[PDB]
Amino acid sequence: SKYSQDVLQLLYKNKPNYISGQSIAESLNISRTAVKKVIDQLKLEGCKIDSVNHKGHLLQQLPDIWYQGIIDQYTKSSALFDFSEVYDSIDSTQLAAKKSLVGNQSSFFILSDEQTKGRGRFNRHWSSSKGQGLWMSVVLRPNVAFSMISKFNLFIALGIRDAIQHFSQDEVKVKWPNDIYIDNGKVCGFLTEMVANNDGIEAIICGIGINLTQQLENFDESIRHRATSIQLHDKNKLDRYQFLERLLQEIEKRYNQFLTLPFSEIREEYNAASNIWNRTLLFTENDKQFKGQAIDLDYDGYLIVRDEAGESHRLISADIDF
Ligand SMILES: O=C1N[C@H]2[C@H](CS[C@H]2CCCCCc2cn(Cc3ccc(C(=O)O)cc3)nn2)N1
Incomplete structure (x- = not known):
């Protein structure tokens, strides 16, 4: 209902402690009965919440769905992102980001469970199926000249590769300049765009598409031999939240390097990581x-x-x- 995200945010914020229904009721100022209805709805959508009488509720595990309430916890603690926009469906996170940056200097990212009109380089179609991938656009504000766009793309590749590699048993390699592979299968494509003039860069827009939990049968029959997903290389079930958390970690790490290091300092690292x-x-x-x-x-x-x-x-x- 109107309060699903608010209840979810409290359940997440309180891990690993239980939270009583009375406690949720008093903080959102809604009835005990309303709170149970919301909890019942969250469990309906795949949330794993343990409910114990006289004690309360504990969020155990989120489903394969993006929830703004959860992602708001990530931006709250972030020293890089001011906010984020989370959608269940959209035409393109990149189109949305290019519209949302106009008229401000905010740093933010946009997440969508599915894209209706995902586009890669050269206006190629990018499959963005619901529930199976991370479709994200990132807007940053580096105070650098516009020629630095190519260097950003290099630093960010290692960031994405590092976050993926963390969840994969097999080697994750960069295919210069815009693709990531696990063995022969492409697991990620990204692209770096900018708004700029002669006096510098107004915004960097980095669109990142990552295959999280496809099964081989979910890829096309033509591309199946050179397409893969993170889950296909993780013995443990892949958690969207856990991955997004490390991906945001690495993007920030590689973005500060981009601002402080010449490409010479990561160049050798970049070659060992390329296929x-x-x-x-x-x-x-x-x-x-x-x-x-x-x-x-x-x-x-x-x-x-x-x-x-x-x-x-x-x-x-x-x-x-x-
Ligand atoms: O619209 C949006 N764009 C961004 C955000 C979230 S996704 C993100 C997508 C950007 C993709 C950039 C990388 C790329 C690679 N290629 C060639 C290619 C692509 C797929 C296959 C395949 O068969 O898998 C093979 C070759 N083109 N572009 N939103």
Whole structure:
């Protein structure tokens, strides 16, 4: 009802202690009977709440659904994000973020259980099924020149990779510049956009799509051989909250590095984490396509490639297939 999020927030805020119905009733100023109705509704939606007479209620486990009340606890304690917008469905978190940043200097992120019109690089369709992935857009306000956009994309890749790697038994690798893999399966795609002028950056908008709990049968039949999810590499059930918590952790860690470190300081770390070496890569450049081999990521984030004809390229960004 009107108070599901408020009750949920109290149940979460009180872990691991039980909270009595009277206590919830007095803090939301609603009847004992209303409180039980809300608790019954939360359990209906998949919340695991233990209820004990004379003692109260204890949130044990949330379902595979984003709840604004819970996410409000994360932003409350965050030293980076002012707020967040949580939706069950939306056309795109990226479209929503680009609209919400206008006219302010807030830092925030937008979460949606499903996207109706998810878009990747080059306006590609991004599947954003309900209940199976993290579809998030992040808006930050770095006081840096606009050329720094490429460096942000490099620092954030290691952040996303680190959070995923924490939950995966198999190695998680970055595919420069915008994709993350677990073995041969893509588990994440991200992209960094900006609003800027000559005097600097007005906002960074980072759209992050992560496959959390798909089963192989849930991926398309065509892409199934090169698509994976975190759950497919975690012996334990994957918890959306637990993952989001570490993902926000790492984004903040890598965002402070971005502001304080040159790319030289993470470059070596970035190479050990990339899966683009010692292999034929296929490059797309508008109309042209060609094969080549990645030689190095230089000190400035540029990939150095020796193409099939022996010629060299130095690319700030590329469209790479395996
Ligand atoms: O609209 C929104 N965008 C963002 C936020 C939440 S998601 C987030 C999505 C951004 C994706 C950026 C990375 C990317 C990769 N590619 C090529 C590609 C993509 C999928 C497959 C596949 O078969 O899986 C294969 C190749 N394009 N773009 N909201």
